[PDB]
C-alpha cells in the first residue's frame, strides 16, 4: 500500500524543473564586468 | 562632473591681476594739482 505513496515520491523527485542555471553565473558576470565599471567610473572623472 | 566646471571658475575668480591700482589716485593726484594750476594760470597774467 505504501508503493502508491511513493509514486508521489518518485514525482516529487522528478518534477524539479529549472536548477541549473549556469549563466545566472554569466548575467551575474554581466553585473561583474559592469559593476566593475562603476567602481572605476569617478575616477575617469578624478584624474581628469 | 560638475566639479571641472567649477575648475575653470576657481581659475577665472583667481586670474584678475591688475585691479587695485591705487597710485591711479595719485597719477589723478598729478592731474588735480597740475590741472590745479590749470585754474589759475591766466590769473596771474590777470593780476599783472
Same mark, same amino acid.
Request: net charge negative.
Given at each position: 500500500?505504501?508503493?502508491?505513496?511513493?509514486?508521489?515520491? =518518485? /514525482?516529487?523527485?522528478?518534477?524539479?524543473? @529549472?536548477? $541549473?542555471?549556469?549563466?545566472?553565473?554569466?548575467? =551575474? /558576470?554581466?553585473?561583474?564586468?559592469?559593476? @566593475?565599471? $562603476?567602481?572605476?567610473?569617478?575616477?575617469?572623472?578624478?584624474?581628469?
Amino acid at each position: 500500500f505504501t508503493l502508491i505513496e511513493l509514486m508521489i515520491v =518518485v /514525482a516529487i523527485i522528478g518534477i524539479l524543473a @529549472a536548477i $541549473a542555471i549556469p549563466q545566472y553565473q554569466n548575467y =551575474v /558576470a554581466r553585473s561583474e564586468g559592469a559593476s @566593475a565599471l $562603476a567602481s572605476v567610473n569617478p575616477l575617469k572623472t578624478t584624474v581628469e
